[PDB]
């Protein structure tokens, strides 16, 4: 992608001061608060990609305070997925709960990516939580998230069988000629 000069200066400075709480906070107040919207999104996106999740959480906190801020599912998705990839499952789940409270609407790929993230980290309970949220979505569920779950839940046949049963009951016709279980 595409990272401007101010955004790049901030990213290098945050990573530089990462372990000094004192210097970091002053740097944030001095160089990060003035960032324009596009540049803040650019900085949090790069931190998330690099899995500098502690700095990303700080950026998200600054962002929420901005005059232009409006809760966005993708902004939450990106952070949660970065957290799961860094094995901060509790922080990730907590952000997912906060997202739900803001009444946002994950698309199917969002449910699926979060679920894959939790399963990868060996957290079936968290995956199932997101799965149960997916079943309550306004949208009808797509099959892909079920295939992910059934393959990630082999070591946990009670969870896997429950998912398998939710599918057959939700897609009687589709279960028949296209098993996600298979």
From Swiss-Prot:
Changing residue 49 to E: Abolished RNA binding. PPR repeats lie at residues 72-106, 107-141. Keywords: Chloroplast, Plastid, Repeat, RNA-binding, Transit peptide. Changing residue 34 to E: Abolished RNA binding. GO terms for molecular function: sequence-specific mRNA binding; single-stranded RNA binding; zinc ion binding. It comes from the Eukaryota. Changing residue 116 to E: Reduced RNA binding. Disulfide bonds: none annotated. Changing residue 151 to E: Reduced RNA binding. It is found in: Plastid, Chloroplast. Changing residue 16 to E: Reduced RNA binding. One of its GO terms (cellular component) is chloroplast. Belongs to the PPR family. P subfamily. Binds weakly to specific single strand RNA (ssRNA). This is Protein THYLAKOID ASSEMBLY 8-like, chloroplastic. It comes from Arabidopsis thaliana. The lineage of its organism: Eukaryota, Viridiplantae, Streptophyta, Embryophyta, Tracheophyta.
């Amino acid at each position: 992608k595409l990272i401007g000069k101010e955004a790049l200066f901030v990213i290098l400075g945050l990573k530089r001061l990462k372990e000094d709480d004192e210097k970091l906070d002053k740097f944030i107040k001095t160089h990060v608060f003035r960032l324009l919207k596009l540049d803040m999104l650019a900085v949090i996106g790069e931190l998330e990609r690099q899995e500098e999740t502690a700095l990303a959480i700080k950026m998200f906190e600054v962002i929420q305070k901005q005059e232009w801020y409006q809760p966005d599912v993708f902004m939450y998705k990106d952070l949660i997925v970065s957290l799961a990839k860094s094995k901060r499952m509790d922080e990730a789940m907590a952000l997912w709960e906060k997202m739900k409270k803001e009444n946002l609407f994950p698309d199917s790929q969002t449910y699926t990516e979060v679920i894959r993230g939790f399963l990868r980290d060996g957290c079936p309970a968290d995956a199932m939580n997101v799965y149960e949220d997916m079943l309550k979505s306004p949208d009808p569920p797509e099959e892909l998230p079920f295939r992910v779950l059934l393959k990630g839940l082999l070591p946990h046949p009670l969870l896997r069988n429950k998912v398998k049963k939710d599918f057959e009951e939700l897609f009687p016709e589709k279960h028949a000629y296209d098993p996600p279980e298979e």
